[PDB]
Structure formats: structure tokens, C-alpha cells
Design an enzyme around this catalytic site. Structure first.
Site, short mmCIF file in Angstrom:
data_model
loop_
_atom_site.label_atom_id
_atom_site.label_comp_id
_atom_site.label_asym_id
_atom_site.label_seq_id
_atom_site.Cartn_x
_atom_site.Cartn_y
_atom_site.Cartn_z
N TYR A 1 12.70 -13.20 64.74
CA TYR A 1 11.47 -13.93 64.49
C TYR A 1 11.51 -15.30 65.17
O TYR A 1 10.52 -15.76 65.72
CB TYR A 1 11.20 -14.11 63.00
CG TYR A 1 9.85 -14.76 62.77
CD1 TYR A 1 8.70 -14.23 63.37
CD2 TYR A 1 9.73 -15.94 62.03
CE1 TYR A 1 7.47 -14.86 63.24
CE2 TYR A 1 8.49 -16.57 61.90
CZ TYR A 1 7.37 -16.02 62.51
OH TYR A 1 6.14 -16.63 62.41
N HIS B 1 11.39 -22.49 55.34
CA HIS B 1 11.02 -22.19 56.70
C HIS B 1 9.71 -22.89 57.03
O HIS B 1 9.52 -23.40 58.14
CB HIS B 1 10.81 -20.69 56.89
CG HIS B 1 10.16 -20.35 58.19
ND1 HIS B 1 10.88 -19.96 59.30
CD2 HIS B 1 8.86 -20.39 58.58
CE1 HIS B 1 10.06 -19.76 60.32
NE2 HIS B 1 8.82 -20.02 59.91
N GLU B 2 8.79 -22.91 56.07
CA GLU B 2 7.50 -23.55 56.26
C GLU B 2 7.67 -25.06 56.28
O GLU B 2 7.03 -25.75 57.05
CB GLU B 2 6.55 -23.14 55.15
CG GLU B 2 6.36 -21.64 55.09
CD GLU B 2 5.71 -21.07 56.35
OE1 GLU B 2 5.91 -19.87 56.62
OE2 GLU B 2 4.99 -21.81 57.05
N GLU C 1 8.33 -21.59 65.76
CA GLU C 1 8.94 -20.65 64.84
C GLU C 1 10.46 -20.73 64.97
O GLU C 1 11.19 -20.66 63.97
CB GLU C 1 8.45 -19.22 65.12
CG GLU C 1 6.95 -18.99 64.85
CD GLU C 1 6.48 -19.52 63.50
OE1 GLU C 1 7.09 -19.19 62.45
OE2 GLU C 1 5.48 -20.27 63.49
N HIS D 1 8.12 -26.22 59.61
CA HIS D 1 6.92 -26.48 60.38
C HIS D 1 6.35 -27.85 59.98
O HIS D 1 5.69 -28.52 60.78
CB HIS D 1 5.89 -25.38 60.13
CG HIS D 1 6.29 -24.04 60.68
ND1 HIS D 1 6.39 -23.79 62.03
CD2 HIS D 1 6.61 -22.88 60.06
CE1 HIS D 1 6.77 -22.53 62.22
NE2 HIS D 1 6.90 -21.96 61.04
#
Lengths: 733, 9
Positions: free
Chosen positions: A685, A643-644, A692, A647
Site C-alpha cells: 500500500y 496511519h491517518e 501514502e 497524513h
């Protein structure tokens, strides 16, 4: 010179439990009894002693003795180690059960030439071990059920054809803790039997031949583990518990008598944190701050946990004796969050992993914490080593959540909260090899009952070198920065409730740190070669300081293999290189994120810190992953990491666009629209904001579970297509 | 700084 102490130790215990009463000049028959009981693990004899047992070497019909005068016709007919029925007044051994145990052995000339009797004697001794001793400390248990199951469900039936009765042989499913619950005698026989075969040198080879798993167990148990059994047995004895407490109380007597007032004030505020006071908070609040505190629906934000929410909420109640939301306030609360934290020293150490100088808190408090810590460090100067005792075990009751909230979520069986889920248990025992204490451990001299949320019972073996401070209530306060090696992890029953016993040995923190450092060095050789980076680059860093130490390290590898096997090799290399070019880092740690330089270094204000499971920092081009927590319903860490990395993908693509500036592709109008539409189709989320959403989406698309890959495809197509464009864009460009 | 918050202890 040290084996002789052992023979020395023997004679001692013998003197008590071993009572001879013969005709044929005891000097000989006795001599024989010593050579027989000499084969039995020394500590089993002291354990028998501990429970008031005694061994009598008499002549003739064994039932013709004081101790066996009361035996009931039923318990007068036995069965030997082989299952053959016999008559007590005709046999040579018997172990009386009861609150006054009795071992009667018939004095015979030879026990050597007669490998059969010896076997039986040991079998009745093993019966004592399992039925009379271990049963007082809730054992055998799961660890043993395991040896039993391995035996039956093994293709080679010969194992069973030696240790199991037919009752066990027939039984369908494996023997569960429940089975054992209502079959204690059954297991005890098998235990006793295997103990027997093992003890008697002649029958030992047979065990190792047809029932290796059993041999192994009894082998390890009698060569070491047993001594811990004796330890636990003693911990049950009131007098033993106090004899121990006293020696230690005495070894620190001067230290205590000399302890000042302030000294005690410290040891005290270290055990119970000071909560924030209203009269101060309110007093601190600036004019506007105090005012602004009325238009706040505190329950609005999220970075404020319920406790904080409620706390803040009652601050209004005192101010009221009078006459979503903006980010300027969001700021105000991120500011108050810091101020409403309990002054908890040990907490401070755990969060910073020992770096007490971290600028993650307001200078004044940072200083206040440093002063007290440097002081406690001075106070805890006298080491535990003493001439009043050798090996000393201390105990600590811990909450699983402290080490891994994720597994801690499924540790207790949801149908029976007294049982521990073997599944999560196994995963939890997996890579737990070493542990680190960055704060002061507060242990108990003698083991005590635990709290509800505490299903972890540590049994720690202190080093003579380890410094500590004595407390009147029978607890020791150990010095910070302890190194601990995990020696054994097993499930145990205590008070009709199951717990995970962790047997650890204190060692030099440096020894552990060296392992961490050697690992970090190794992991880069490996992933530098895979990603094809310069041989000596520093990509991955292990910032490990707390108790579930070794795990953080061993999961980083696995997290990366996941990362690898789910994403396009060329996307990995392109983005990863971008990160390295900016000195980026993959930080796997167990200290709260606001204490990692990679984040706090690039902060504007301190109150702008973030603590979470994962975090991406553009300014540092690093990905931070906090292991001790539980991601908001993230199956595991792999996902959160990816998930990071999302980013990160967002951060590179945007850059490739207009190379003149660091802007996110997730910011483009083209995307701001896809989000404004499909931005409510995936995880809640994801609904937070574009970056996000992009990441949440990016993640699902690369999940190990295709079911999830499809969800994005048939719910956020405009997105699934976007992310895939960005992937080619980066891969090519 | 783009996170992925944990679950309140």
C-alpha cells in the site's frame, strides 16, 4: 398482587404434571408434595411438562408403580447426591429418562426437618433439568463449562471437593466442549448437584461458601435466565411455534387485509433489491462514455469490487456486437460505480445511518429512496403490543462481518468450521453493550436455521411500543431507528455447529443516543485536558448509528490511548492544535465514510467520494475512521488511525514550510526522490504514492511492535531519517 | 483525501 399470580401459575401447572396417588388421606401427603415442589423454579416445571414429563407422589417401594414396572436391573441400582450406592426399591426418588419421562417421589410426612431427602429430591429434579430438559436445547454448554473450569483451576480445592467426581478431579486440562461431548452425563451430574444444593435452602449457604462461582451461576439462572430456557424449549415445539405465529398474524389481520397493492410492492422491493439493468446502463452511457467503455481494462482500477468489475466487464459484451490507465477514465468509472449499485433501501439506511438526505448519491435516487422510506415508515404504523400476549421474542440471523469484519475474519476456527474461536469471541463480547438499527430489521417469529456466513443468532425482546409489519411467511418487518440493549452474549451449539447467541431488549433509541452523546462529551473533557486544549472544544465526535454501536464508542478511547503511547506527546499537541484551529475532527463512525459531512461537504463531485477504513480530509482537517470494516491487513484500528495521523503530520509540516500555502512536505522534491527509491521497501500500500508511503512509513515507525519499527530503519533509512526530521521541525517550529 | 482502503467484503 403480582407475586400471587405466580402462586396462581403454580397451581395451574401442578394440576397437570403433579398426580397424587396415596392412602393416608391424600389431602395431607399432597399438601406436603406442594410445599416441596414449591421450592423449585416455576419454569422448570412447565419445561418438564413441555417434554411430556409427569410427577407421581406414591407410597411404599417406588419401583412398585406402573411407570417403573419396566426398569432394568442395571437402572435399578442408583447413587444419591453424595455418591453412596443404593437400591431403588429402597429409595424415595427416581427420575426415569426416555421419550416419556417419569418423576416418582415417595410420599413422606416431613421434607423440611429432613434436609437430606429434600436435597436428593432436588438433585433428581436437577438431573431432570440438565439431562431431560436442557439437553433438548443443547445445554449445559460453554457458559457452564466456564463455571466448571473456574472451580477446578482455582487454588481452593474445596470447590471441587463438593461438586466434582474424582473422574473430573483427576482430568488434567480444562474441560473443553469436546470433553462434554463424550461426558454429558458427567457434567449433568455436576449441574444437577449444584442445582440441588442451590434449591434446597439449607444447603444453599454451603454452596455459596465453598463454590461461589457455582452458586452465582445457579442463582442468576434460576432468577431470570431460566425463563429464556423455557422460551427456547417452546421454540422447539411445532404447535407452540404455530400458536405464536397465529396470534401475531391475527393481531395484524386488519393491517394486512387493508394493505394496498403499492403497500405490498414496497414491503417486497425492501426484501429483495433490484439489480441494475444493462438495457438502462448502456442506454444511459453518453456517446463518449459508451465509446470509452472499450479501451478499459476494468480489472485495472481498485475502487471497483469484483462484483462491480465483472458487472461492468459484461457491459462490453453487449456493445461488442459491432464493427495502468488515464484518470479521465478513472473518473468515468468512479461515476459508473454509483450507477451500478443495487436499489437496496435497507442498505441505503445503514450506509447513511438514517441521514437519508446525504448528498452521497445522485439527487434523483436520493429522492426516490426518500419517497419510499417515508412511505414504509407510514406503512409500519401498527405496534406489536397486543392483548393476545405479553413478552414476545423475535429472532434475527446475522453475519459477524456486518458488525466487525476484523473479528469476523477469525471467528470460525480454521481447523473446525463448526466451532467458534473463543479468542475472537471474547474480544467480540467485550464492549458490546448497546446496538442501534437505522434500517428496517426483518426478523422471524420463530427461530430458523441460519446461513453459512451467519454465525450470529439474535434473540430480541420487543417493546409493546415497537411498530412492525406482518409478512405471510412468518417474518415481521420492524420500524427503523430501534434502540437495543445487549443483555447477554454466549456461545451455543445448534445443529452440530456453534453460534453466538445475542440476547437483546428493545428500548427507546434516544436512551441509547443519550449514552453516545454523554460519552462524546466525556471523552473530550479527558483528551482536552491531556492535549491541553480549551476546556470546551469539540475535537472528537461519535457518529454512531448501526448495530455494533457501543463498540465504536469504547474503541475510540483505546484507539487514542494507543495513538498517545506511541507518538511524541509534543508532536501530538502541535499537530492536534493545527487541526483544531481549522475546526478539525476525529470522527469515529459506523456509517460509510461518504456520509460524513467532514468529507462530502468539501467534495467537488459526488463520484469523488471515498469509502475506506480511514481517511484524512485536509479541507476539514479531520480524521475519519470507519469501524465496521477491516483495513487491508491492519492488525487493528489503532494502526489505521495513526496511519491517518500520518497524513495529518504531512499536512502540518508542509504548511510550516511555506505558511503561505497548504502543500504537503510529502510533495517536496527531496522526498519525491526518497520515495522513488525506498518507496517499494515497505508495505505494498505504501507503494501507492508519496503521501501514502509517508503515512505507511510514519505508521510502522510508531507501531506498538518494534519488530516493525526496525523494518523501516533497515529498509527505508533515507525515509526513517526524513520523517524524524519533520518531527523535530514541527516540534520546535 | 488520503485514505487507507478496507478489504472487499
Amino acid at each position: 398482587e403480582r407475586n400471587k399470580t405466580q402462586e396462581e401459575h403454580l397451581k395451574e401447572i401442578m394440576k397437570h404434571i403433579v398426580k397424587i396417588e396415596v392412602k393416608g388421606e391424600e389431602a395431607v401427603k399432597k399438601e406436603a408434595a406442594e410445599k416441596l415442589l414449591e421450592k423449585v423454579p416455576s419454569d422448570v416445571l412447565e419445561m418438564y411438562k413441555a417434554i411430556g414429563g409427569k410427577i407421581y407422589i406414591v407410597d411404599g417401594d417406588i419401583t412398585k408403580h406402573i411407570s417403573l414396572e419396566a426398569l432394568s436391573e442395571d437402572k435399578k441400582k442408583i447413587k444419591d447426591i453424595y455418591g453412596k450406592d443404593a437400591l431403588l426399591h429402597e429409595h424415595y426418588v427416581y427420575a426415569k429418562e426416555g421419550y416419556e419421562p417419569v418423576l416418582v417421589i415417595q410420599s413422606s410426612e416431613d421434607y423440611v426437618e429432613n434436609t437430606e431427602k429434600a436435597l436428593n429430591v432436588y438433585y433428581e429434579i436437577g438431573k431432570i433439568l440438565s439431562r431431560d430438559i436442557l439437553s433438548k436445547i443443547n445445554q449445559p454448554y460453554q457458559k457452564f463449562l466456564d463455571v466448571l473450569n473456574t472451580i477446578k483451576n482455582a487454588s481452593d480445592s474445596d470447590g471441587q471437593d463438593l461438586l466434582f467426581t474424582n473422574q473430573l478431579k483427576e482430568h488434567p486440562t480444562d474441560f473443553s466442549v469436546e470433553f462434554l461431548e463424550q461426558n454429558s452425563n458427567e457434567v449433568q451430574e455436576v449441574f444437577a448437584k449444584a442445582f440441588a444444593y442451590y434449591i434446597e435452602p439449607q444447603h444453599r449457604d454451603v454452596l455459596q461458601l465453598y463454590a461461589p462461582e457455582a452458586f452465582n451461576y445457579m442463582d442468576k439462572f434460576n432468577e431470570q435466565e431460566i425463563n429464556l430456557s423455557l422460551e427456547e424449549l417452546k421454540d422447539q415445539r411445532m404447535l407452540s411455534r404455530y400458536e405464536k405465529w397465529e396470534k401475531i398474524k391475527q393481531h395484524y389481520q386488519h393491517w394486512s387485509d387493508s394493505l394496498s397493492e403499492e403497500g405490498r410492492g414496497l414491503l417486497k422491493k425492501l426484501q429483495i433489491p433490484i439489480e441494475p439493468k444493462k438495457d438502462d446502463i448502456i442506454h444511459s452511457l453518453s456517446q463518449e462514455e459508451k465509446e470509452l467503455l472499450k479501451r478499459i481494462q476494468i480489472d485495472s482500477s481498485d475502487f471497483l469490487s469484483t462484483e462491480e468489475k465483472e458487472f461492468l466487464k459484461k457491459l462490453q459484451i453487449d456493445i461488442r456486437d459491432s464493427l495502468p490507465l488515464s484518470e479521465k477514465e478513472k473518473e468515468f468509472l468512479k461515476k459508473l460505480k454509483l450507477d451500478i449499485q443495487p436499489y437496496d433501501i435497507n442498505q441505503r439506511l445503514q450506509d447513511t445511518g438514517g441521514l437519508i438526505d446525504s448528498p452521497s448519491i445522485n439527487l434523483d435516487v436520493r429522492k426516490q429512496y426518500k419517497r419510499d422510506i417515508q412511505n414504509i415508515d407510514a406503512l409500519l404504523h401498527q405496534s406489536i403490543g397486543s392483548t393476545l400476549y405479553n413478552k414476545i421474542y423475535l429472532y434475527e440471523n446475522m453475519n459477524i462481518n456486518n458488525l466487525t469484519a476484523t473479528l469476523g475474519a477469525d471467528l470460525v476456527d480454521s481447523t473446525d468450521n463448526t466451532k467458534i474461536n473463543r479468542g475472537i469471541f471474547n474480544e467480540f463480547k467485550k464492549n458490546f453493550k448497546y446496538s442501534i438499527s437505522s434500517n428496517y430489521m426483518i426478523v422471524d417469529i420463530n427461530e430458523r436455521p441460519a446461513l453459512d456466513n451467519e454465525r450470529l443468532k439474535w434473540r430480541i425482546q420487543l417493546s409493546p411500543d415497537t411498530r412492525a409489519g406482518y409478512l405471510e411467511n412468518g417474518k415481521l418487518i420492524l420500524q427503523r431507528n430501534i434502540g437495543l440493549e445487549i443483555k447477554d452474549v454466549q456461545i451455543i451449539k445448534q445443529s452440530e455447529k456453534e453460534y453466538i447467541r445475542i440476547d437483546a431488549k428493545v428500548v427507546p433509541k434516544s436512551k441509547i443516543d443519550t449514552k453516545i452523546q454523554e460519552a462524546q462529551l466525556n471523552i473530550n473533557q479527558e483528551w482536552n485536558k491531556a492535549l491541553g486544549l480549551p476546556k470546551y472544544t469539540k475535537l472528537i465526535t461519535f457518529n454512531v448509528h448501526n448495530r455494533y454501536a457501543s463498540n465504536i464508542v469504547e474503541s475510540a478511547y483505546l484507539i487514542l490511548n494507543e495513538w498517545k503511547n506511541n507518538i511524541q506527546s509534543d508532536l501530538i499537541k502541535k499537530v492536534t492544535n493545527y487541526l483544531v484551529d481549522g475546526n478539525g475532527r476525529f470522527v469515529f463512525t459506523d456509517i460509510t465514510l461518504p456520509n460524513i459531512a467532514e468529507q462530502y461537504t468539501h467534495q467537488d463531485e459526488i463520484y469523488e467520494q471515498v469509502h475506506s477504513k480511514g481517511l484524512y480530509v485536509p479541507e476539514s482537517r479531520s480524521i475519519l475512521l470507519h469501524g465496521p470494516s477491516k483495513g487491508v491487513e491492519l492488525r487493528n484500528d489503532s494502526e489505521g488511525f495513526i496511519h491517518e495521523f500520518g497524513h495529518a503530520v504531512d499536512d502540518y509540516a508542509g504548511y510550516l514550510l511555506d505558511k503561505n500555502q497548504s502543500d504537503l512536505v510529502t510533495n517536496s522534491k527531496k522526498f519525491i526522490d526518497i520515495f522513488k527509491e525506498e518507496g517499494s521497501n515497505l508495505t505494498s500500500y505504501g507503494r501507492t504514492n508519496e503521501a501514502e508511503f509517508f503515512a505507511e512509513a510514519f505508521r510502522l515507525m510508531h507501531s506498538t511492535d518494534h519488530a516493525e519499527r526496525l523494518k523501516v530503519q533497515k529498509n527505508a533509512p533515507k525515509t526513517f531519517q526524513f520523517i524524524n526530521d519533520q518531527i523535530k521541525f514541527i516540534i520546535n517550529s | 483525501v488520503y485514505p487507507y482502503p478496507m478489504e472487499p467484503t
